[PDB]
Design a protein around this ligand. Structure first.
Ligand SMILES: OC[C@H]1O[C@@H](O)[C@@H](O)[C@@H](O)[C@@H]1O
Ligand SMILES: OC[C@H]1O[C@H](O)[C@@H](O)[C@@H](O)[C@@H]1O
Ligand SMILES: OC[C@H]1O[C@H](O)[C@@H](O)[C@@H](O)[C@@H]1O
Ligand SMILES: OC[C@H]1O[C@H](O)[C@@H](O)[C@@H](O)[C@@H]1O
Lengths: 294, 317
């Protein structure tokens, strides 16, 4: 059941493609989003840019903000401030040789770099837990595997490679043979975590990247209610960056609506950002109590 | 040792630095003003360059009371001694930006710092290429190597200076710049530099086919009453890419030559971290330097490669 859909327009980036966004967030009575900005015919040449919402389905580069030399930007609120992250790619003579999540904290126009995750780990996401501890999802996929970890820290400055690498494995069984992990994590009223996730399947081969969700219990490390909630075909049509990404959606996360439905934001085809209007995916596990109101 | 127990191995550069401060000829000086960065400090700039009929500089932008919180921003020249952040340009999450022209395009670099729980854990040079408003990231140097600089040689090859000790090697094409190439560079004749650390900021091709290097050389100065100073002087030398020989090594600038400015911390009271030179119509040069990790100035000096040829490289993009 899809109740609506749109592709976002992004002004102020010279017609470049904008995709794999953060969720939208608010600051000083405006709405913002971070976008991954890249030329359609260029690969691994992304920057992350802060955009201000200026109209229905329309954002414009905010000229005051610095830009970040990162792919796949994401935001969360921890202890009353923004934590911003993205992938920082290292190349060796034009070839990708490493990639690591970089983390910034502060206010949206005043972000300060404070840590990187481990070498070759992309899928790190944070959330504030009901008791005020910080939850960390990790993704182990450097050794052929594709496993999700979870750990906690007290303070964002404690986010270290050692903490991330030591995260206890979650019950990954429900995910089947999917690679990926959360894009956005929500605290629910139950104290459980609602995860909006990206899972890729190779289907004997078709490359599928699907919008998924699951509920996680920080007390037991159990995963519940794993499901698909979006595919690229749900969004308005758009030619993918190359034909091999014709069924690739890289989820951004959800935004609750007054009516109790939500906007599911996703990168699509590595060329655009859209949303589909869907039913609340964590129905029966509590309402979202986290926000990104800065 | 002339410092006795204060330092039993005084850097051999100390007499050169004091002698330069007695004998220097300075024809003018200024501190640059930067608009559009919310009062933040701007320092350790690239040299100025031209593009599309305007003048630009990259600056390292950091709050005076913040440490290891830099971004590199493209500034457009507004007036004499005055630049403003260019709003169209992206920013780079780098320290100590530097530019050079290779094979008709800009090569842009800076230091990318990695932290682990707020503490510096790694740093490496990142390199971009293209046009000034359209730079594309293509390589990083080795872990913990800051002092890598490029130049286009007389024969069209690319010269690479490395800092382990200063090294030199060549490649054909900028996409060949790899950790493996950088780490395999042969050592240069270190005799004149001695036990002073640092390396080139900016390299120029001269009409002689030699390289003019504008360099940063430093040492630690223990003071009887004061704290330990991190001394950085502006230096120059001429390099022969065929023999790895160094000629005409000298001091060409020190912090005290520039207009006064309170350093970021007291230990940087004699720190001038050079950016490089810009030729003037009158045959003198503007020597641009970061000063005190708080500002960018220039001093007007004699051409430091006098007698080794005219600069034939450019940064006219
Ligand atoms: O702090 C003094 C100088 O030290 C050097 O090693 C570099 O880190 C420069 O960026 C700095 O200006
Ligand atoms: O992170 C480096 C590189 O890795 C993968 O190939 C994809 O996620 C690309 O979008 C990205 O540019
Ligand atoms: O598909 C359309 C979409 O493509 C790119 O992502 C950008 O140029 C957007 O501004 C535009 O709306
Ligand atoms: O005052 C010295 C210098 O300090 C900082 O680098 C900036 O505020 C500059 O604009 C200023 O000129």
């Amino acid at each position: 059941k899809i109740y609506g859909k749109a592709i976002l327009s992004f002004d102020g980036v010279n017609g470049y493609d904008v995709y794999n966004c953060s969720i939208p967030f608010t600051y000083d009575g405006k709405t913002y989003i971070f976008g991954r900005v890249e030329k359609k015919d260029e690969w691994v040449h992304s920057n992350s840019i802060l955009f201000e919402k200026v109209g229905e389905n329309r954002y414009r580069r905010h000229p005051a903000s610095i830009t970040y030399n990162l792919e796949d930007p994401f935001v969360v609120k921890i202890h009353g401030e923004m934590v911003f992250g993205g992938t920082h790619v290292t190349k060796n003579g034009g070839k990708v040789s490493d990639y690591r999540c970089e983390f910034y904290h502060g206010t949206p126009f005043n972000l300060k770099y404070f840590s990187s995750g481990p070498s070759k780990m992309k899928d790190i996401r944070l959330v504030e837990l009901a008791d005020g501890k910080i939850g960390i999802f990790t993704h182990f996929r450097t050794e052929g595997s594709c496993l999700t970890g979870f750990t906690t820290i007290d303070k964002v400055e404690d986010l270290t490679v050692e903490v991330i690498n030591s995260a206890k494995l979650i019950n990954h069984r429900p995910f089947g043979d999917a690679w990926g992990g959360p894009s956005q994590v929500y605290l629910l009223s139950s104290g459980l975590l609602g995860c909006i996730s990206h899972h890729g399947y190779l289907l004997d081969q078709l490359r599928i990247y699907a919008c998924t969700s699951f509920v996680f219990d920080p007390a037991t490390y159990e995963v519940y209610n794993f499901k698909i909630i979006g595919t690229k075909g749900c969004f308005p049509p758009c030619e993918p960056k190359l034909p091999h990404l014709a069924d690739c959606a890289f989820v951004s996360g959800i935004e609750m609506r007054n009516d109790g439905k939500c906007n599911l934001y996703s990168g699509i085809g590595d060329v655009a950002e859209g949303y589909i209007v869907i039913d609340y995916p964590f129905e029966g596990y509590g309402k979202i109590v986290s926000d990104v109101a800065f």
